Amino acid sequence: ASPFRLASAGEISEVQGILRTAGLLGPEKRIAYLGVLDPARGAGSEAEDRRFRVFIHDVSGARPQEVTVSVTNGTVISAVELDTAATGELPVLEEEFEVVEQLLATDERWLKALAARNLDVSKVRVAPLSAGVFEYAEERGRRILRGLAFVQDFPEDSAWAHPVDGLVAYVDVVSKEVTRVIDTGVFPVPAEHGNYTDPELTGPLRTTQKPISITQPEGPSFTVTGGNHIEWEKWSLDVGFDVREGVVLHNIAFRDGDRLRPIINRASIAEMVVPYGDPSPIRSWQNYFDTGEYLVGQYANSLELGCDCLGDITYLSPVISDAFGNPREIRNGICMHEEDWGILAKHSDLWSGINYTRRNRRMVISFFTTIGNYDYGFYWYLYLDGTIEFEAKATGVVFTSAFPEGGSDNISQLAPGLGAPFHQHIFSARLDMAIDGFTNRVEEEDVVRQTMGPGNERGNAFSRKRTVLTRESEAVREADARTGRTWIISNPESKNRLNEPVGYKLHAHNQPTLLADPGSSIARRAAFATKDLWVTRYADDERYPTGDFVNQHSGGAGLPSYIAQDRDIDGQDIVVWHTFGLTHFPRVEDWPIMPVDTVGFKLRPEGFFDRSPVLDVPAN
Amino acid sequence: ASPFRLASAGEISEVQGILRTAGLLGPEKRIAYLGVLDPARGAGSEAEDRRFRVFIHDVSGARPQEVTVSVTNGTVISAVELDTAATGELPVLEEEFEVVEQLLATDERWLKALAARNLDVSKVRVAPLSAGVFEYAEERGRRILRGLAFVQDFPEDSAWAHPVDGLVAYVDVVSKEVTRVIDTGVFPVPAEHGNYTDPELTGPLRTTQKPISITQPEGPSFTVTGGNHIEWEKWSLDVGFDVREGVVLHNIAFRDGDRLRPIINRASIAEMVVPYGDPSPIRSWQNYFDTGEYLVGQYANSLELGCDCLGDITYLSPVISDAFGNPREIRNGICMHEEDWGILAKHSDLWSGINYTRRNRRMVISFFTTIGNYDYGFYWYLYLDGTIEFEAKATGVVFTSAFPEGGSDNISQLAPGLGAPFHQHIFSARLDMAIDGFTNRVEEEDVVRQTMGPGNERGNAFSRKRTVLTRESEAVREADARTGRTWIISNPESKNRLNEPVGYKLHAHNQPTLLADPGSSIARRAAFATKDLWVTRYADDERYPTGDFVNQHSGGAGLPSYIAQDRDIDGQDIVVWHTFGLTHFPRVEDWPIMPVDTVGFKLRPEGFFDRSPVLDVPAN
Ligand SMILES: [NH3+]CCc1ccccc1
Ligand SMILES: [NH3+]CCc1ccccc1
Ligand SMILES: [Cu+2]
Numbered sequence A, B: 001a002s003p004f005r006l007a008s009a010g011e012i013s014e015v016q017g018i019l020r021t022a023g024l025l026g027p028e029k030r031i032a033y034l035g036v037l038d039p040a041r042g043a044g045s046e047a048e049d050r051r052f053r054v055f056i057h058d059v060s061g062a063r064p065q066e067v068t069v070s071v072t073n074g075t076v077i078s079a080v081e082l083d084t085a086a087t088g089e090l091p092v093l094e095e096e097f098e099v100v101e102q103l104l105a106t107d108e109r110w111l112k113a114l115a116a117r118n119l120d121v122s123k124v125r126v127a128p129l130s131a132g133v134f135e136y137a138e139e140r141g142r143r144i145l146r147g148l149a150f151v152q153d154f155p156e157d158s159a160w161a162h163p164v165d166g167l168v169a170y171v172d173v174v175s176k177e178v179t180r181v182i183d184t185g186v187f188p189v190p191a192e193h194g195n196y197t198d199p200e201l202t203g204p205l206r207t208t209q210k211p212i213s214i215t216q217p218e219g220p221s222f223t224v225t226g227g228n229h230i231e232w233e234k235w236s237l238d239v240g241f242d243v244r245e246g247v248v249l250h251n252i253a254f255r256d257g258d259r260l261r262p263i264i265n266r267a268s269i270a271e272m273v274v275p276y277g278d279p280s281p282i283r284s285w286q287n288y289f290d291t292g293e294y295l296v297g298q299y300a301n302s303l304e305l306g307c308d309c310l311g312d313i314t315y316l317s318p319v320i321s322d323a324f325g326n327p328r329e330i331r332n333g334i335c336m337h338e339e340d341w342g343i344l345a346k347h348s349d350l351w352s353g354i355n356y357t358r359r360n361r362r363m364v365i366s367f368f369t370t371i372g373n374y375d376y377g378f379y380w381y382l383y384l385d386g387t388i389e390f391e392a393k394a395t396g397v398v399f400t401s402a403f404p405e406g407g408s409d410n411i412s413q414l415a416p417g418l419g420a421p422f423h424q425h426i427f428s429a430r431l432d433m434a435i436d437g438f439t440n441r442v443e444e445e446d447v448v449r450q451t452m453g454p455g456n457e458r459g460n461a462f463s464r465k466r467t468v469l470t471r472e473s474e475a476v477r478e479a480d481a482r483t484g485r486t487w488i489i490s491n492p493e494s495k496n497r498l499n500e501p502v503g504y505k506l507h508a509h510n511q512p513t514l515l516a517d518p519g520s521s522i523a524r525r526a527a528f529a530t531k532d533l534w535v536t537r538y539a540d541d542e543r544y545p546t547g548d549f550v551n552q553h554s555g556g557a558g559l560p561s562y563i564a565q566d567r568d569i570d571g572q573d574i575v576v577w578h579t580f581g582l583t584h585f586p587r588v589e590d591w592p593i594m595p596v597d598t599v600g601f602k603l604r605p606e607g608f609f610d611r612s613p614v615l616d617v618p619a620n
């Protein structure tokens, strides 16, 4: 009965029928995106209307469409023809992955390049890479993918060990034309394999690891009702799933005594981008938006008990649409479980004689996605003490190149002849804030150093200052680790027992933001990634920091367009957008398969409660 | 048989007898510090000599002594009389904790202050606080503690809820004289209790937490031999324990195939300091060095199975000396266990069809100490993938004051009338490095941004630069989060298969360093805390960043004295000193007992191995 419930197979089958009947799902059509729309603000009228948004691609070159349909009312609400030279191309289709390799396999320029390197075309895999927007005027309005080649020695070989450098091709996947084949020189194809299941590479496997058994003999402490509504240790929330964003958290709230107190209305990773820092023409165009161009949710893995998730696991199996509107279950796509988290609070008092120890725990909601060479785990954590944390875990295989004779300032060597270009992995968290309700504001908090002198005679004092961000034009903020800079989201109309506004503090990891030159194409297309923190006024249609159609969009859409409205954000319905990322100079230890590295952020209560909220936790 | 073995009860009893026989342990003597000395460099002659260092205090006002004794040879090696006006006072004795309260309880000025506030002297606890060095010339050469008062309403009451502000006393604990009683005004004693085991405060305890059972049915994967030698998943090390530093890690090494490869010779937290940022004369002198002034190891807790450490736990019970030379066991003072740590590596390959997942785990070595109101857990982690991590967990009760009517720029309000002054918790990790042996060097690594232009026509390139630190005068470094600054410790004479020097990268959290004015007493006494990274040339006697005798030392000893020698550190036996800390603006949620907050650092291999070192981990 909940409007925030997951999409069902039947809902998607109804959408397909509505689209078909309306003439919008002919045999040349493909669904490139399908997702449920969130309820509008002020839907508390209790009139459920399950609406879906659909992007429809046309493989014959007709104009794609954006369609909204109501499954509640069985009708098409709106259907808009898109001009992609203007607003951007639709996301990459899974079925286009193979089309780049097959189109090149009959191109005479491509075959000529492979023949000069003595490569059998049947062994050559071609990565289908998003094109971006660069200097090629013939690409405007065309659906382009670029291809980089890797050799597979045999069908189980790891092709990433064998990049074919000095060669790139551009393909129009609608008209099935190879527009350009660039061959800048022959590089030796690196010879060593990277087959990390080969006993010859792994050596004998360890016999020394003894099992760790994690069990919950009376079951888990959380309940799941209505398919996706979680209650756990005073927390309440709904777990959603979107094919673009992946796991989305709705209605995060905390039961403080009798009141259910809202904290976050909607939390998601709304974009991610991987820019490469290699100036070679073979790769200098390479930047993929896994979220906005490829849709990370449709590549979610089926997670295996005991391998991917350990302990007493509850699964959710979200349903998405395939390219024809058929429902597709992602079996065991979301893992949910609670984890011991060490000591929560501890004190042995010399004067009272009381010895006090309490254990912490956290609720984990996670999913794992794979897009080509890279694999990412997205983890949301809820802690007993009111802390909310996000963690991204990056693993998979690094994207490779040749390592040039005589070295490189922008590539590291992983193996003889084998290089890994420098790159970043940058995420945008979109936090639709609702601290005790919707009237919120953001303050920037800096440590303040004080000089020795009158009133500070021993030179020990220090303080802090808070600056309210009142309008969108002043709410684009940078990190400053040296001044301990954090941001507090408060509700000026909701006070704690000390008559101070209730709040939550955002703690960032303060990693570098986008390194590319501010005049570059990527700095325009990924403008969100150039600053650590943005605050906007909530609006229904301002969903992604990069805009709705990221693929081949020329830049400036999303956040820099939103904030030009200069709306009032001082005690209003606001959205915080936090940029965070990893700068990756690949190491030898990252090869042939990369150990997990992590990045994230956390929010901690800041005078939200009237005292510690974990005084009622028992002693195990 | 290992020279790095823990001190035994019999060794300490032998030391006591040697001291007694030599006339150094008369009835006016107290042992203020006793610890085993590490073997000297070049002890590979196989001639074990177990030597102990002893600080001896004299309660009758005679000069203290520093004594070194050999239990192997039953002799006193050296005995030096100390001039404490010059080199510093000895650490605080546990038996002096009560002396401040008892001396004040008969002082007419003290009684007059309490009577004006209607406080029964029998209910007034006095914290024994280290004095530092300020403007009082009569304190030079005297053993001074300062006292701040708290009211206990009944013997099980939490006195921290009831600070007596506007009152401080200074005491000479050797001559048993109250030197000064300062009363700057009456403040209401805050009335609410902070008794976090009181059902009236906690409410009904939760019934919703179900048990998490962590077991190892075939036992743990690590072995302990020789009392304190650990082998676990290719790691090798010795766990030491020192009454000043706590847990110390020796001879950290990793078995890479057939070679045992050294990584760190000695790792410890060598100092910590808590400076307060309240300019009130009542507290503006307050800075305690829990390590150097109080000795955190002698306050280590006995850790309870299932409460403090959960899972399959192996304990170590270290032995220290009491004030008279008797051995004192700290039962269950060190917890050792392995922990599941999620996904280690994962990839599903679109071209090979191979699906690959491996689990991570970590080895945990931990202890917990309590000094007055504060409690700290020290955690060392070893991971499968070669990562070493330290984490400090701060909890306990915040140090309190009155909250002034009309507010404060340097104190936060926790309850009606009750304040918590701003402060920092700053740690110094001392890492005696041994990356593949003792010829090491440190490079500082910054990200380098590049401008659009020739050779970088699309403005996407970025790079990195490494600066070798060649002499001690240039090896005092600051963090720079914005440039992704890290430090690499390498061995220029040991190369990986790519002919690159092997190394480890130090990743800092980049929290603010010491905030006090550079001209303050604390900035001189805690000079290490003003910079993030120092590198020195190894020397036997350069043990602590603050010097051997921190209590009441006037400043400048330790690191700023060491680095003035300007020694060669480029491919030499070097020591890295990393400052890291938390800046604490107390929140309401920190009261009446504080949920754990954390800080730390990690080291990750950087071309130390020839490929991922976890290819031989099995699939569970
Ligand atoms: N992550 C999106 C880029 C990509 C997609 C498919 C194969 C290799 C790389
Ligand atoms: N942590 C060292 C300071 C201290 C010592 C004893 C009581 C309160 C405070
Ligand atoms: Cu990467």
Ligand SMILES: [Cu+2]
Pocket (backbone or CB within 6 Å): B394, B398, B423, B424, B425, B584
């Ligand atoms: Cu603190």
Ligand code: NA
Pocket (backbone or CB within 6 Å): A265, A432, A433, A434, A438, A538, A572, A573, A574, A575
């Ligand atoms: Na909002």
Ligand code: NA
Pocket (backbone or CB within 6 Å): B265, B432, B433, B434, B438, B538, B572, B573, B574, B575
């Ligand atoms: Na060294």
